[PDB]
Ligand binder design. Structure first.
Ligand code: SF4
Lengths: 83, 155, 112, 97, 69, 170, 317, 105, 113
């Protein structure tokens, strides 16, 4: 198991640019899989207001869709205003 | 008065050419070292604003240094003819003045006066770098004291 | 004939309130006038009919001028400070004048 | 709009007349081919801008990439033709008769 | 010495600090004490067009606050 | 006000010179005049990305196309637009054919193609005024997310283009 | 507006003329000379006299050249070099483009088009050598430089230039992106042809490159365009990477800090010119496609992953 | 398709930008989106030969929307009648069309 | 605006060419208009065919420029909602570009012929 380490240290001493490039490449490949903030990027891009989400009609049916904009119902943003 | 305006425009157009004149990265000789010694920072070209460009289309003054042989003669006249029309020639050294050594040789053109006009003859085998820095001062005052727009006016 | 409404139908009280001062009273407008504005956008997205939604256009203009009438009658001076501070900036960025915003919200919560 | 689109159609008909004849070089014909690349980009972007169909904005970068990649293939093809011949001309290529 | 280059570098600094300060002051004099709005999107351009039509003297920079309403 | 029609007539002139086929060193100059014209056309139309993107990709391609003209396909006495007189007569013939085409095209059709005070008014069809995304950049940004097969096939075109060009130039 | 055109276009000419003066003085003090002391009070009237010598000398009309491209390349070269300054930010720009980084990139390649038309239509073998090493130099730099600008504008989400100063209000982009910063400074040396990466002007392997047959007048106007590009990309590196503190109440304090920083960057540029030896057209292409392009592809990889790992997705404006 | 592998596997790969009325980035509808939607939902599996006589009215309205040919012809005769009436001197121009009035926002 | 700035730059550089040409004195002859090559006349014509030595690396400069114009919409594609397939597509095409340049680096065509 010393041959791979000797080749890695020899390339590190001689031409370290491809070693740094492949290490940063593998870090960029594996670091979204490690980091817990990968799932917050889709939350950011969903919870941004970007167009008008239009009001819907009601027959007294759904309780989750609010009437006042300052109601506690609906998808809140305490994970973005405080965090 | 119009002659005062003409002479002050002549001084304003000759002040630029006496200050920012641009020589030639020449060679050919022992005398190539002393052009490099006027480039050297004891007696300095670039303090006067005297810049070794390499191209003959961009040069303004030609410092012919040392020997000018029979093979070098079209290789000197072609370069001087492709200098643009304010063309001043310094001849560094006695081999470009009148052939210092090799006056009686088979293959030296006997001075640079045989081929191009030379506006200042700077003598020595070393012209010291201060001595043709005096030579660039004397060409500088020569084309300060030339009158181009004045004899454009009275003509 | 494509029907168009007459000019006397469009003889409304138009709001003569500019861009940065509207951006100053942006979030309080959406806080207060939420029934008539969402009624108007519900009309304009399910009816697709600008000839039809004029009668709610009068209601949203009346709510906007009533909201500005409440601000002008009660809270004129920190509103003038905050909209002049917002009109000073380039892209009406809210970050530059948050010190005026605390005075504006404290005066609005004090009076209105 | 129809004056601009009909003049782009005239520019394509002119560049059709250009790439459909040969004067002295294959490279000026390949410049006419790249003129067809530029004319089809301008036509596609003008069509997408005035129809406002912004979902089909992947199409003109695909036009540029595929047509300039085959243009680059033909540019190195002329490099291999001039390497295997030493000349470049249209009348040089009559050895397959 | 080291303080020889600094006169020419100082007039270089003065003559290159003059265009940014001059363009900020001429944007202030163009837009009357305010700054010129930038239209990155179409909403800012319609906002500035509505600002011109609210002001009514074909002017973006003057604006109608609560003094008209 | 007549910006797109004046630019499109200049594009017709530049593609006419490219079509009339000089030495391709000069043809690269004429085609990049047409490229600056087309970049300014898309930037005057509303594509703030597409014109500068074709100027970047076209200047960068046409640089080394120009280098291949001046290396491989060059000639001792080349032909510009003013060298060969059949090319010059074809140039003035195409110029008078273009202005005769617009002189018959404002008169034959009786529709809104060319009018002396009514052209340029039908250029912008509809952009949203209160909308926020109307430039061309976000639609070509959507090929990473919606139209993913476009980026798959373009990346495979460039990968196969590298391998195909190594096999050609070997 | 035309007052702003004249008072932005005149003192940038005075600034690049004084950049040529502080080039000769800074290379002099590097090289133990004093620099052009004898004309002006300390050198100030040297580049005005250089323009007033090189424009009252005449140009050639050579037989071998093509006259239309001979007169149409340098008018382009001064127009594009003075027209890259119009999307530059300052506090508030002369012209705010929507997307100005692509304008900087494309018209910076069009400056090399002016150089390349000079190299072909100058019609020397030396000039054709200079034209093809312009081609090989841009083959080295252009893909790398646009990957750098792309991979830093994954931190500032638009291509606008005012968005760079509202991104760089709190900190410089030197500190998150110094592997970007060193290779961008090297790549913009390769862009603007300065003495490590100066080929194509040459002066020490060939005679002049693009201005062999170009006499005074158009050589001066190329010289105008080249040092305008030097102070231009010095100021562009200064605004994009070590962009100073921005106060909305005091824009002139930020402009003075930006100009002290830009004279530091221009002194670093001429310091690099009088510190390093010169490259080759083979080794230039070799390491800018070998020791740069895997590293800037990995930096493109890492800044693609940077709105996913640390969840900084940049705003639109 | 010829090989209908997208319909076989059930995954759209090029099919989600096929017409003008496809889904768009950030929900920004194209011009003539309602006309294209009513044209496809009037040609909803009818067939080509029956649909070109059935929804010819909806295609003609969508083609009129997209190319605006009769609209530009109508505005062309309106502008030609304006040039004729201004050369005659009968048409006094209104100040609303001249632009010298206070505008509504 | 920008068209007027481009045209006043045209007018400034055209005024500088007119003051560069028409104001200085000029006599021109055949040896003055002879092309410069080291002080002698050129051996052949100056437009004689160059045998190009950076040809395959020139074509991959062109194709890499097509890749960076593909990669130019990615600062606005970072704002998209389908960020998983966006980052997977960006990962797979930068991997495609790095593998293509690694193939060219192993085949050693970066050196000239
Ligand atoms: S003048 Fe004297 S020093 Fe100069 S080349 Fe002749 S012998 Fe040598």
């Amino acid at each position: 198991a010393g041959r791979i380490s000797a080749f890695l240290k020899n390339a590190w001493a001689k031409e370290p640019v491809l070693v740094v490039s492949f290490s940063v490449w593998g870090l960029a490949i594996i670091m979204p899989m490690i980091s817990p903030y990968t799932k917050y990027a889709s939350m950011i891009n969903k919870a941004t207001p970007y167009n008008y989400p239009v009001p819907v009609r009601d027959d007294g049916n759904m309780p989750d869709v609010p009437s006042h904009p300052q109601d506690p119902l609906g998808p809140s943003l305490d994970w973005l205003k405080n965090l | 008065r119009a002659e005062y305006v003409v002479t002050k425009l002549d001084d304003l157009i000759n002040w630029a050419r006496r200050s920012s004149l641009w020589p030639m990265t020449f060679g050919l000789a022992c005398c190539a070292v002393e052009m490099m010694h006027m480039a050297a920072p004891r007696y300095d070209m670039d303090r006067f604003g005297v810049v070794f460009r390499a191209s003959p289309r961009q040069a303004d003054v030609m410092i012919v240094a040392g020997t000018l042989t029979n093979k070098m003669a079209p290789a000197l006249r072609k370069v001087y003819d492709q200098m643009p029309e304010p063309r001043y020639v310094v001849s560094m050294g006695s081999c470009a003045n009148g052939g210092g050594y090799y006056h009686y040789s088979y293959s030296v053109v006997r001075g640079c006066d045989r081929i191009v006009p030379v506006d200042i003859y700077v003598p020595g085998c070393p012209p010291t770098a201060e001595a043709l820095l005096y030579g660039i001062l004397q060409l500088q005052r020569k084309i300060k004291r030339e009158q181009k727009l004045k004899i454009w006016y009275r003509r | 004939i494509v029907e168009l409404p007459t000019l006397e139908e469009l003889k409304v009280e138009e709001v003569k309130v500019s861009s940065a001062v509207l951006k100053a009273a942006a979030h309080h407008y959406g806080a207060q006038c939420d029934k008539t504005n969402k009624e108007f956008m519900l009309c304009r997205w399910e009816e697709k009919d600008p000839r039809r939604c004029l009668k709610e256009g009068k209601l949203v203009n009346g709510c906007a001028l009533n909201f500005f009438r409440q601000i002008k009658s009660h809270c004129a001076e920190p509103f003038t400070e905050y909209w002049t501070c917002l009109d000073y900036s380039n892209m009406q960025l809210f970050r530059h004048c948050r010190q005026q915003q605390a005075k504006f919200d404290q005066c609005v919560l004090d009076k209105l | 709009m129809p004056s601009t689109f009909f003049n782009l159609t005239m520019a394509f008909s002119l560049s059709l007349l250009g790439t459909l004849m040969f004067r002295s070089h294959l490279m000026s014909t390949l410049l006419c081919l790249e003129g067809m690349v530029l004319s089809l980009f301008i036509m596609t972007s003008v069509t997408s801008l005035n129809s406002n169909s912004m979902s089909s904005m992947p199409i003109p970068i695909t036009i540029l990439v595929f047509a300039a990649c085959e243009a680059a293939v033909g540019l190195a093809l002329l490099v291999k033709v001039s390497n295997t011949y030493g000349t470049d001309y249209v009348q040089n290529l009559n050895l397959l008769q | 010495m080291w303080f020889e280059i600094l006169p020419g570098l100082a007039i270089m600094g003065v003559c290159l600090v003059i265009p940014g300060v001059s363009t900020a002051y001429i944007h202030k004099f163009t837009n009357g004490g305010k700054e010129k709005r930038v239209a990155r999107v179409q909403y800012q351009w319609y906002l500035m067009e509505r600002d011109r039509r609210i002001s009514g003297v074909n002017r973006y920079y003057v604006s109608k606050g609560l003094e008209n309403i | 006000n007549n910006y797109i029609f004046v630019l499109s007539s200049l594009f017709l002139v530049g593609c006419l010179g490219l079509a009339l086929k000089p030495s391709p060193i000069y043809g690269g100059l004429g085609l990049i005049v047409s490229g600056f014209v087309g970049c300014l056309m898309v930037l005057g139309f509303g594509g703030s990305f597409l014109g500068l993107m074709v100027f970047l990709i076209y200047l960068g391609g046409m640089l080394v196309v120009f280098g291949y003209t001046t290396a491989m396909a060059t000639e001792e006495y080349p032909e510009t637009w003013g060298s060969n007189w059949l090319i010059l007569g074809f140039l003035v013939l195409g110029v008078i054919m273009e202005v005769f085409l617009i002189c018959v095209l404002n008169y034959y059709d009786e529709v809104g193609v060319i009018n002396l005070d009514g052209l340029g008014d039908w250029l912008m069809y509809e952009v949203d005024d209160v909308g926020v995304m109307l430039e061309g950049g976000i639609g070509v940004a959507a090929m990473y997310s919606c139209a993913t097969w476009m980026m798959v096939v373009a990346g495979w075109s460039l990968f196969a283009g590298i391998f195909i060009i190594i096999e050609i130039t070997r | 507006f035309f007052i702003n055109i004249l008072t932005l276009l005149v003192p940038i000419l005075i600034a690049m003329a004084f950049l040529t003066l502080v080039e000769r003085k800074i290379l002099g003090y590097m090289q133990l000379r004093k620099g052009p002391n004898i004309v002006g009070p300390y050198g100030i009237l040297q580049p005005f006299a250089d323009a007033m010598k090189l424009f009252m000398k005449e140009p050639m009309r050579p037989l071998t050249t093509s006259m239309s491209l001979f007169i149409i390349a340098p008018t382009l070269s001064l127009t594009l070099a003075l027209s890259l300054w119009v999307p530059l930010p300052m506090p508030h720009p002369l012209i705010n483009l929507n997307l100005g980084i692509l304008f900087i990139l494309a018209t910076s390649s069009l400056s090399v088009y002016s150089i390349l038309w000079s190299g072909w239509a100058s019609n020397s073998k030396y000039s054709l050598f200079g034209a093809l090493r312009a081609v090989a130099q841009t083959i080295s730099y252009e893909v790398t430089m646009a990957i750098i600008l792309l991979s830093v504008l994954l931190m500032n989400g638009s291509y606008s230039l005012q968005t760079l100063i509202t991104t760089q209000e709190h900190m410089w982009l030197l500190l998150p992106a110094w592997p970007m910063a060193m290779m961008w400074f090297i790549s913009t040396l390769a862009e603007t042809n300065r003495a490590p990466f100066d080929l194509t002007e040459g002066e020490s392997e060939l005679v002049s490159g693009f201005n062999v047959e170009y006499a005074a007048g158009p050589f001066a106007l190329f010289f105008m365009a080249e040092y305008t590009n030097i102070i231009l990309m010095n100021a562009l590196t200064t605004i994009i990477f070590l962009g100073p503190l921005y106060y909305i109440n005091l824009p002139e304090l930020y402009s003075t800090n930006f100009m002290m920083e830009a004279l530091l960057l221009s002194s670093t540029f001429l310091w690099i010119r009088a510190s390093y030896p010169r490259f080759r057209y083979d080794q230039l292409m070799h390491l800018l496609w070998k020791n740069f392009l895997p590293l800037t592809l990995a930096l493109c990889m890492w800044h693609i992953s940077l709105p996913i790992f640390t969840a900084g997705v940049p705003p639109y404006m | 398709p010829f090989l209908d592998i997208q319909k076989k596997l059930g995954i759209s790969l090029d099919r989600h930008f096929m017409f003008l009325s496809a889904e768009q980035p950030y929900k920004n509808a194209a011009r003539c989106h309602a006309f294209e939607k009513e044209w496809i939902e009037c040609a909803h599996g009818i067939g080509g030969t029956r649909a070109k006589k059935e929804c010819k009215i909806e295609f003609d309205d969508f083609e009129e929307c997209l190319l605006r040919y009769k609209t530009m012809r109508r505005m062309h005769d309106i502008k030609k009648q304006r040039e004729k009436l201004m050369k005659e001197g009968k048409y006094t121009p209104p100040p609303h069309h001249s632009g010298r009035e206070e505008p509504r926002p | 605006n920008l068209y007027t700035v481009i045209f006043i730059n045209i007018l400034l550089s055209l005024t500088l060419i007119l003051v560069a040409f028409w104001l200085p004195q000029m006599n021109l002859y055949s040896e003055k208009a002879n092309p410069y090559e080291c002080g002698f006349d050129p051996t052949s014509s100056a437009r004689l065919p160059f045998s190009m030595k950076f040809f395959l690396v020139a074509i991959t400069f062109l194709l890499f420029d097509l890749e960076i114009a593909l990669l130019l919409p990615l600062p606005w594609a970072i704002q998209t909602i389908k960020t998983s397939t966006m980052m997977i597509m960006a990962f797979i095409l930068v991997t495609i570009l790095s593998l293509g340049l690694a193939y060219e680096w192993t085949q050693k065509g970066l050196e000239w012929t």
